[PDB]
Structure 1
Amino acid sequence: VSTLIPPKVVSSKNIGSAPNAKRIANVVHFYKSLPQGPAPAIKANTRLARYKAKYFDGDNASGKPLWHFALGIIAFGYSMEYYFH
């Protein structure tokens, strides 16, 4: 004889179907993350890492590193050809 109780029965009722499914996905995606640009890790110098933080950086990454690599390759090849040819 008791009336229905919508706001009293919300323990099992969630927000539709998709919103409750994505609530767990969105609650923790924003929890454990850097606030703003933390840990840049820019500093690196290990020849390969020296190239990474010197010319191979993605801020520009223009053809200048490629031209420098080609210049070094042809400089080595000149001596190689002198040895061979």
Structure 2
Amino acid sequence: VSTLIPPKVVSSKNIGSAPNAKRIANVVHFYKSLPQGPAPAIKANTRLARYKAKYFDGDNASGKPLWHFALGIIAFGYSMEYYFH
């Protein structure tokens, strides 16, 4: 008989609920959390970003840069021994 039934006026399940707080958070916070970032530095001809590219990539964890840096200093004081004497 009756045509009076809940769905005609719904006006508070079409609004309220807790995940809205999370929703509005991640449209503002995460749209500017760019997918690749702003492409962070790791190379360039600044004469020391090139150093970073061969040795200090976040991938490298090999003993090669350590050795490379060490060998210069061995040559430094030994030559300087002959520069002072």
TM-score normalised over the length of structure 1 = 0.60
- For residues 47-80 of structure 1, give each alpha carbon's deviation from its aligned partner in whole angstroms, at most 9, with x where no partner exists: 2211011222122132210110000111112112
Q: Any gaps of 5 or more consecutive residues in structure 1? A: none
- Give ranges in structure 2 of 5+ residues lacking alignment: none
Moved more, 74-83 or 16-25: 16-25
Q: Deviations over 1:10-50 (max 9, x none)?
A: 77778656422222211133423545688465541222211
Identity of aligned residues (%): 100
Misfit runs of 4+, over 3 Å: 1-18, 32-43
**TM-score of the aligned structures, taking structure 2 as reference length:** 0.60
Matches within 5 A, 1:7-26: 18-26=18-26
Q: Is the 8 A contact 1:42 1:53 kept in 2?
A: yes
Which whole-Å CA distance do the structure 2 matches of 1:74 and 1:32 have between them? 48
The structure whose RCO (Cα within 8 Å, separation 6+) is larger is 2
Greater percentage in strand: 2
Q: How many residues align?
A: 85
The structure with the largest alpha-carbon Rg is 2
